[PDB]
């Protein structure tokens, strides 16, 4: 503060001016070939055709996800990293407690080739695995879609039905309840045990817990990000012996402790 | 060539020095905003001189990755999450072609398994969601199903259709008017004239939908959301 503070501020201004001039000169020497990085223009939630996505309060939408158009997402649901829910030509509905895992594409069709064109409907407590493709089909509540599966238009996955990972489910195929289908093309594999129904339910419940920690981390401001970076650095290691010599006990701050519902134990 | 690469390298030394100088100047004024973790993603990224050339009418989603020598024609569209890598060889996309969301159009990273084939996409071509095209050629007015994989040396002739989820093995020539599907992809049936009409109508529609999406993304960035993110507590 004072005269010295102002003098140092002015000197720093001169230094920044020189630095930016040097940066420009270096860019010119590079031959203007390097494309400059710019402010991010990705929109997590975007309107189209005067349709606005309707997202419930406690829904984790990853910043890298693309939710576009007439899309409705219910309470407790989670849209993970790289997910694209493009509801531009029709409606996309997602129920409560449903996870759409990383790099998934969900799209619709304005008109199918034959039959009645329908929107994409995903029910409650539904798990959609990583990098799945859901196109113009219907997934009823408490269903399972394995990672890398592709559901075409008209596919119906019934309650307590499973589509195995990597399956290509042909158009208008119906997966009956208590059944697991798989392959390319998908076909009946076997029946689902009760332990597997328990697995499906526990999957959706585990993902609601995982969504909370991810939503908390992704919404932190710059100041909080820096505070927690410093805390993480300060508590990365320990010297409990010197603490005992000093007669103190160092405790992990609460901002660095995860909830018990996401820990392996 | 070598001289350009030397100049490009020496420019990085001058630039890194200037940026460090700017950081010093901010540290003297008590500013730490240079420490903010901001995304370094570039929609169009260059590898030295190899830069993407994109038509002024072609829509590219901001989250798409176009790397190296990648040519996009007029009326074409690159949708959300798509990745196009043209480093070891070139990638060309014809006019009026839609590359649907999360698709990957790339060339071989190394020449260990032979000469690196380029990827050629013709005009009015539909590439379905999450398809993988690796060093193949796709002729004009063809249909690639969502989730299909075309390996290197694959030729997809005009009016030819690759079914959804099909794995077309290396050097597999798809003849005109034929539907190939499965793993590995084999002949399934002959294409119908209604299917050819639907292919053309679909590509025309996607060019019109892309126009709509390219308009809404052009909207000025909302200062209200900027202020909301800045003032979070």
């Amino acid at each position: 503060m004072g005269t010295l503070g102002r003098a140092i501020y002015t000197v720093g201004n001169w230094i920044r001016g020189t630095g930016q001039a040097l940066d420009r000169v270096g860019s010119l020497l590079q031959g203007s070939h390097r494309i400059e990085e710019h402010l991010s223009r990705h929109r997590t939630l975007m309107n189209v055709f005067d349709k606005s996505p309707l997202v419930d309060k406690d829904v984790f939408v990853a910043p890298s996800a693309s939710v576009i158009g007439d899309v409705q997402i219910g309470k407790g649901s989670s849209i993970w990293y790289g997910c694209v829910l493009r509801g531009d030509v029709n409606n996309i509905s997602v129920g409560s407690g449903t996870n759409i895992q990383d790099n998934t594409l969900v799209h619709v069709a304005k008109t199918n080739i034959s039959g009645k064109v329908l929107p994409t409907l995903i029910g409650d407590n539904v798990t959609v695995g990583h990098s799945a493709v859901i196109h113009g089909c219907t997934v009823e509540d408490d269903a399972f879609v394995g990672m890398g599966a592709t559901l075409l238009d008209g596919v119906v996955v019934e309650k307590h039905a499973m589509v195995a990972a990597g399956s290509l489910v042909k158009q208008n195929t119906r997966i009956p309840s208590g059944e697991v289908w798989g392959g390319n093309p998908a076909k009946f594999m076997r029946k689902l045990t009760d332990e597997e129904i328990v697995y499906i339910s526990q999957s959706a419940k585990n993902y609601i817990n995982l969504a909370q920690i991810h939503a908390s981390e992704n919404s932190k401001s710059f100041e909080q990000i820096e505070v927690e970076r410093a805390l993480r650095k300060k508590y990365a290691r320990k010297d409990e012996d010197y603490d005992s010599m000093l007669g103190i006990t160092r405790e992990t701050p609460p901002e660095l402790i995860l909830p018990d519902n996401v820990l392996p134990g | 060539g070598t001289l350009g690469r030397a100049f490009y390298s020496v420019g990085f030394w001058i630039r890194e020095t200037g940026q460090a100088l700017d950081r010093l100047g901010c540290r003297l004024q008590g500013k730490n905003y240079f420490r903010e973790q901001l995304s370094r993603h570039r929609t169009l990224m260059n590898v030295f001189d190899k830069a993407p050339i994109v038509d002024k009418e072609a829509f590219v989603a901001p989250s798409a990755s176009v790397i190296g020598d990648v040519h996009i024609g007029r009326g074409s569209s690159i949708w959300y999450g798509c990745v196009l890598r043209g480093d070891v060889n070139t990638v060309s996309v014809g006019s009026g072609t839609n590359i649907q969301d999360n698709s990957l159009v790339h060339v071989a990273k190394s020449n260990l398994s032979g000469k690196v084939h380029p990827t050629i996409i013709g005009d009015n071509v539909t590439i379905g969601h999450s398809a993988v095209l690796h060093g193949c050629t796709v002729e004009d007015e063809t249909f690639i199903g969502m989730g299909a994989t075309l390996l290197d040396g694959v030729v997809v002739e005009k009016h030819g259709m690759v079914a959804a989820g099909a794995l077309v093995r290396q050097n597999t020539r798809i003849p005109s008017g034929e539907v190939w599907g499965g793993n590995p992809a084999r002949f399934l049936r002959k294409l119908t004239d209604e299917e050819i009409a639907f292919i053309s109508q679909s590509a025309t529609n996607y060019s019109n939908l892309a126009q709509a999406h390219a308009a809404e993304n052009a909207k000025p960035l909302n200062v209200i959301e900027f202020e909301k993110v800045l003032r979070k507590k």
Binding site: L4, G5, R6 | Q29, G30
Partner: peptide, 29 residues
């Protein structure tokens, strides 16, 4: 407009004095 960290300002002055003193030390030796 002004840098407010007074300890940092003192340290900046100390570094400047070190640099200028090193230059003068060389020039007069």
């Amino acid at each position: 407009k002004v840098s407010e960290d007074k300890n940092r300002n003192y340290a900046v002055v100390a570094g400047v004095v070190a640099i200028v003193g090193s230059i003068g030390w060389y020039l007069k030796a």
